[PDB]
């Protein structure tokens, strides 16, 4: 029912960086994915 979401993203200048979101429902995750503007290099979803 609850998930942690980790993404490796790449900005327009080529810099790669991790974001860490915690305690999301799958619905929250689906919305988060649609709210992620930079290129997704890696994505991890892990049930808590």
């Amino acid at each position: 029912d609850s998930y942690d979401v980790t993404m490796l993203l790449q900005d327009d200048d080529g810099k790669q960086y991790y974001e860490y979101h915690k305690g999301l429902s799958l619905s929250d995750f689906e919305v988060l994915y649609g709210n992620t503007a930079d290129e997704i290099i890696k994505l991890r979803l892990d049930k808590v």
Binding site: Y20, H21, S27, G34, A37
Partner: protein
């Protein structure tokens, strides 16, 4: 008084309650100690741009964008000059198929707000880079009451409810008076499962015209 008269006359009792005072105190600390979006001056922008009397359409979102330069205190919209996120791009793609509008060179929906579209998120703040971090802090209590007072309005409101979380608010809305346009969410995971082809913009305008109200000019002009 934190809001213009037509909203304040409906909501003033909420702002006096303990839960709001607790929320305000939490936010005063968090704005000082970390990075919170949107900017604090922008928290109520959806209500500043769209008065209670002027509401024609409500587009419900969840929480603000969590990255720098994005959130304006409006659901879905972004400040001019930043990249449009994927769901917002999908909104513009549907708008293009439905109404015909060209895709704009920015993602700001302020034009819609100025024409009576209430761009209401259910949670009004977020910590940078941490989605849903202000869930359950008091905002949902207030935004439920905003929905309640709109439901209580005599003059009908058109509610656009994209996705499961927004659709849960149907229980608060008096459908003997108000109109509901609902579909799957514009997120890339769900857009091609109902959102695309739903024609929410022309449908909203058709409800307005039936009521003798002026339609929304949905097309966003380049900056």
């Amino acid at each position: 008084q934190l809001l213009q008269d037509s909203w304040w006359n409906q909501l003033k009792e909420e702002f006096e309650k303990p839960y709001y005072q607790e929320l305000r105190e939490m936010l005063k600390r968090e704005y000082a100690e970390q990075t919170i979006y949107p900017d604090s001056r922008d928290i109520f922008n959806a209500l500043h741009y769209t008065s209670y009397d002027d509401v024609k359409v409500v587009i419900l979102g969840q929480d603000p964008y969590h990255g720098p330069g994005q959130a304006q205190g409006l659901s879905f919209s972004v400040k001019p000059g930043v990249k449009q996120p994927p769901s917002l791009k999908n909104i513009f793609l549907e708008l293009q198929q439905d109404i015909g509008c060209s895709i704009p060179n920015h993602g700001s929906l302020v034009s819609w707000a100025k024409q009576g579209v209430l761009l209401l998120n259910t949670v009004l703040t977020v910590r940078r880079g941490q989605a849903n971090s202000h869930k359950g802090k008091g905002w949902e209590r207030l935004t439920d009451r905003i929905i309640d007072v709109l439901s209580e309005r005599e003059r009908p409101v058109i509610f656009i409810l994209w996705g499961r979380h927004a659709q849960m608010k149907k229980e608060r809305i008096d459908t003997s008076k108000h109109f509901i346009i609902e579909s799957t969410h514009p997120s890339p995971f769900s857009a091609r499962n109902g959102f695309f082809g739903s024609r929410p913009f022309s449908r909203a305008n058709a409800y307005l015209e039936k009521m003798g109200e002026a339609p929304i000019d949905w097309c966003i002009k380049d900056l």
